Amino acid sequence: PEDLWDLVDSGGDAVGGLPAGRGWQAGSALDGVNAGFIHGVEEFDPYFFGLDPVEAAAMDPQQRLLLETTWEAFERAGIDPVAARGSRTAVYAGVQFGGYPLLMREAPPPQVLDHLGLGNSVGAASGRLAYQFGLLGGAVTVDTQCTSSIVALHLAVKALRNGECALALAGGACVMSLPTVLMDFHRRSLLAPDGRSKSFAA
Amino acid sequence: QEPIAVLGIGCRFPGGVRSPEDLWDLVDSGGDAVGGLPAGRGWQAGSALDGVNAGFIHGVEEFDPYFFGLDPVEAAAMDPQQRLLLETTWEAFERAGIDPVAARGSRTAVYAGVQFGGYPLLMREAPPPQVLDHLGLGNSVGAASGRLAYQFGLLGGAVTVDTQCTSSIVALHLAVKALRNGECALALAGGACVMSLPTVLMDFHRRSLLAPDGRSKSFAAAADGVSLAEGAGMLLLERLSDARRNGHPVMAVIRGTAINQDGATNGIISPSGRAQERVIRAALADGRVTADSVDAVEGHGVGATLGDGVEVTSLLSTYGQERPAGRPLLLGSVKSNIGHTQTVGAVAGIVKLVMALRNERLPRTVHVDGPTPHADWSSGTVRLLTEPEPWRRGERVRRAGLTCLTLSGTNGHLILEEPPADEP
Amino acid sequence: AARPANPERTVPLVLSAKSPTALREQAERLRATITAAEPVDVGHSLHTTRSSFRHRAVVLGTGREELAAGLDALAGDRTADGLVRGVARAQGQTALLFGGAGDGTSGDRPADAEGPRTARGLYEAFPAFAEALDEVTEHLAGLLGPEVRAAVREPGPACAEPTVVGQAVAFALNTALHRLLTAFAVRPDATLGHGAGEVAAA
Amino acid sequence: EADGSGEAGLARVDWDRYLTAGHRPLPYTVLETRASYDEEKAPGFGQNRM
Amino acid sequence: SVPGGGRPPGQALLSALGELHTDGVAIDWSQAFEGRGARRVDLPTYPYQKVRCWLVPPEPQVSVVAAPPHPLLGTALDLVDATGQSFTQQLTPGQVAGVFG
Amino acid sequence: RCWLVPPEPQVSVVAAPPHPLLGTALDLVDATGQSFTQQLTPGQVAGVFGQQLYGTPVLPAGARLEWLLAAARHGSPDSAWTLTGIRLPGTVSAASGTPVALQTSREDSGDGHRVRAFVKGPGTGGGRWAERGGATVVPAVTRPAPDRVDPESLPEGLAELDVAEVYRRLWRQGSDYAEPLRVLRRVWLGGDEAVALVGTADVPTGPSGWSRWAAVLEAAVQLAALSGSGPRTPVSVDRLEVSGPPSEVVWLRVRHGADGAADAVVLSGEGVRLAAVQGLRLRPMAGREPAGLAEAPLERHEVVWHALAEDGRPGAIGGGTGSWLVFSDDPERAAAWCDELALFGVPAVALAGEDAEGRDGTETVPVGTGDPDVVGKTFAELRERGVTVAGLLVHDAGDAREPASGADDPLDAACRRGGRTLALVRGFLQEYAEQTPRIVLCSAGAAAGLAGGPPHPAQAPLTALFTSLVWEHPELPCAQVDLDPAEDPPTVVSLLGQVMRLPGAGRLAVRGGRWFEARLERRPAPADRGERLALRPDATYLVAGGDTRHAAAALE
């Protein structure tokens, strides 16, 4: 939050260049496109969460960011993740299918192929958080495109009011593992040519 | 504790089932629907599926674009799952007795269980530009709840949910809560599952998880493996008090609901067992019902060798301690006749129990050669329904439960009751 | 808060991590906060808002300048006064040794007065000790008369000498320290008492 | 390399061959990481059910 | 040794406990903060020790034409013993009606 | 119908995969000779290239021989094949993570059935396609073969070997194999012939059909390589003959009966003839260069002293089961450490060299008399008393010999210590080594890079004597503990505690309070700095002390 406040109060913009280091094969099809990317989303720390590095390769970047961001949300809430185990905490995650396995230019090794399913199925994201943090409340994933975060908060607020759960963890992730969402909006000319959302400007 | 009324069910299931009355004939005749790989889908699958058997919908590749106002190119671009929801929703309204035009401008909510079907990956060539424009929205998981609201002019919230096999019972729970909070006037809840790609069959076959004959031998001592199948279904829900004010027909009444996670610890404690024992207690408490009053449970019963035993044990730990004298819990699963049905596994069970209440009979579970040795049946307080039994209206209110489970850890339960059925 | 004033009492500052490198980077992050917030609030936070991992360190000091010098010593990985480091092992395996008064007459007797003259200072530092010491001293004063209160307040060479005053004070201070360690959540799995101290061990 | 360089060299060497060449029945902490330690891991996400 | 240590009397007990807490005992530090004016304050979060995890190796920084092949001429073969150059192509059924206008 | 893809035909062929080394057959219109092409991606290369030489992946010689047979038989129903004049130049290799292109061609010679088969490997940049094998093919072998030979008659004249030692003998020849080529199950060898048992030789595409010959032929190469010494690889075969796919078990016989060449035969589990090989030669590629092949880059290697800040707590000495001997330059230090150990109940004995006086009741040893016999005759006497030994402490005074003697020479100061300590270390082990004692060589001011002033050059013979033990008497634990040359030495229980936490061997140091351990670690070495460098022109240079071979390159 403090980095976002520093950026927003200093009047900066964060749109920039297409990410290198991702395995992309895009030619002239994204030439001159500007967009805002998470640099270093290809980097992770498997040993902290109890994962072997082969499963960390199979996982959708969206499941990795939720699992890191959850630990951070607990540390700032002042709640020890070891005191959260066995709780009636619910999980409501906004996620969409990220395309990640479709980057593979050649057939997968025989170990990673047996991890890919629960690494990439959208409904595995809520269950994986509930597994890592030992949470016994309901674990659902929602998709309603751009409004997936308000849908997650709405269901979490209504669950807490009805007494379904003692806490609720609500949010989402979006990582462009494939170029195709940029390409199609560029092909239909929906993108601004400088890449800026001039929110209410002439 | 407002009771929520099922006004109508539309469905598509294996073996040419197009209605609740078709499913009733297939279960009451003791058939099974499992068969060979679908002809006429574009599958280039090699020797990797030789001997695989599953519950397919024959003819899922066919549709009627002009009835729903679509151009045939847009109808070709859509995920098969969205087409089955759209066809099944109109049939749900037609049985409910609502004119779909009179439903326009209504505060109807939509809650759909859908998972990404892979359909655009069938393409060998890059598609023509007229398909390339329509492919984006027509294959998105979120768009599946939006197209229903656009076609029928609905103004309530629209959500797509994914929790693997529990997606229909989770969708139904959120619809029951939305109606009880007073968010909406009616709610439309259900799901779809159609295998446009062979990859889920291969990923289970590579590990020998599928049964060799493709049958889910629910709770039986054989217990060879799982059995995959397709399906779609929609239920239309309204508050029982508003249903009686308007005079709409009530097929069955949903009385209470719950969802929980099996969590994570050492398997020695049976984490999956403890979770089911809590989800049943929560669902009974939500509806203010009591554990003596339930007659039957439509169990998960998938046929996994250790997996069915934990469920039976959790039922003996819960319903099996509080039976009236000579009223043991009847247990079975529709997943024996039609296979698992994946995201719609809860709709299949509700169609069975709605039809059982109407006909005053409970159907026999197919392939039950003998009860599983991984649980202690010696109390006699729970028993598998190996022959049909009568279930007449009378002094004791007929009630039944449903259990749905999945490997991401979600478990859930519903309690169902008779319609109030005042004399004409 | 109506927050109270105090003298500069020592603050224990605890850090933990899942590998050695993360401990040193955590010490680099914390240095900016201890040099701005008050140290008693920072130490109280780390005791409850963070989990206890396998690699551990403790920093001890009376004030901001000392605590910052210890945290810099951790960050460079160089040993310094008031810094402790190690790798924890989960097994309980703890026992406690107790002694009587008179053995301090065998040699270096003034050190067995200076230990008790140091231990008297704990009555200002830790609240549980003052309660436990009064609750034993006011009880012994019923068997032995008034001098035990004066002796406990001035623990001279009597604490090292084979005497009724010495043995009363030794039972008092050992009973008080046991109630202190069992207030810090140490729990002895065995006890062993040398000579006349066996009543305290029992 | 003004100080702290110590015993220092420049060569093509494969040290994993070097410690397995000849024979060697016990560790040598100049070439090899000193020891393992007491910790445990989870059974994996879905795998306990399949 | 618990009561014995350095000149400030509290550091003896806190250092002896600190060594047991380091070695493994789950010591409760709350007695060191009792009666004192302690508030909660925000702190840094944990420093992750990251490494690369991706199914594909990082892209080569080399510029190339996006789709160079001519539709009818296609790809040049490199048969080692050949007396003269050769080229071959497949047209798939959607491409066929695109080239055959 | 509303679907993205039109329906596939209701009947189609079994579509069996192409053999992975020869791939798709091309269809050039006018061409006389057939040709074939394959690309292997970075994920496929390491799957087919199942052998490593000096760490780099290589195509097995049995796979090259089967590649030619698979290319030969391609269009024909014939089950019996003769290949002759087979030549296999060079090593096929691919640096880890790199593409490979493979190509092959058949030319009919017009000499009846005679076809010539060639195999070719990749090139890029300044490189072009290069030959990596060729053979001449004839079908229709049209001659009988022997009646059943009993496999149990084969091993009777020969010694059996452990399959674990057979694959270790190959590792000491640069070669390692992945599990699909670890096909031997029993081996017998002696004099000039050998025999072996080969299992289901199931390479990729080889759990059934002809591809299994790649591993059965590679087993003949593993065996033919086993009898010699020094690195060697196949170059030629003068005949290979094969009938049918090979059985689930086969018996191999390999013979060295020629002038520097091998012949071999393969029999089925029934004792029926399957294949034969003549003129298998490895000798023309005995001793081919590893320096042009190994995978390792040029790097900077450095000994770094790391603090044992984590877990540096001494622990406990393992009880008084045998004595500790202490030997020192100072009799008072030997006494002090023996007295310190006695307080803990660890029994100890003090020793001194006989140029020092017996001031405090020590034993005395003729060290300085540089013969292991007289020092051994001393240590033997304690065994006749009934002394058991758990370990030996050797302690060295550092620079103190300089002011004590009143003259300086660092080369003399080194050479005086070496012979004394060699006589001690040998003279001890010759009398006790069966007890597996522990040795501690406690130098002072020998360890570089750490604090405590510059290291004394006169200490260097102790580090040499330490490292010489580690590779020559590997059953013994030993450790070097380099003390600060100026600070007071720590309590002897602190030494033996932090030493007994080492299994095997290690180097340790103490400076102030901290313990340190030496580790050898590696970082990149930019030689392009020397390509940018120029030597200053207005100067002389000396190149000194070299032989001709170094001197020519240094001046170059």
Author numbering:
A (entry chain A): 52 to 253
B (entry chain B): 33 to 456
C (entry chain A): 457 to 658
D (entry chain B): 1670 to 1719
E (entry chain A): 861 to 961
F (entry chain B): 912 to 1467
Question: What text comes from the article?
Answer:
To confirm the binding mode predicted by the MD simulations, we tried to prepare cryo-EM samples of CalA3 with the amidation product 3 and the hydrolysis product 2, respectively, and the two complex structures were finally obtained. The cryo-EM map of CalA3 with the amidation product was resolved at overall resolution of 3.84 Å and the amidation products were captured in the KS domains of both chain A and B. The benzoxazole moiety may undergo hydrophobic interactions with A336 and L439 and form additional hydrogen bond with R1718 which is at a distance of 3.5 Å. The polyketide chain and the pyrrole ring could also be positioned by hydrophobic interactions contributed by F236 and Q147 respectively. The C–N bond-formed benzoxazole moiety is shifted approximately 3.0 Å and rotated ~51.5° from the non-covalent 3-HAA substrate. Similarly, a motion of this unit combining movement of ~5.8 Å with rotation of 34.9° is also observed compared between the amidation product and SNAC-N1. Together, the visualization of the products in the KS domain verifies the basic binding location in the substrate tunnel analyzed by MD simulations and further reveals the structural flexibility of the polyketide chain. Based on the in vitro reconstitution, mutagenesis analysis, MD simulations and experimentally observed KS domain complex structures with products, we propose that the CalA4 ACP-tethered polyketide chain first enters the substrate tunnel of KS, and the nucleophile C197 attacks the thioester bond to be covalently acylated. H332 then may extract a hydrogen from the 3-HAA amino group, acting as a general base to perform the nucleophilic attack to eventually lead to amide formation or hydrolysis. During the formation of the carbon tetrahedral intermediate, H372, K367, L437, and L439 may perform the 3-HAA positioning function.
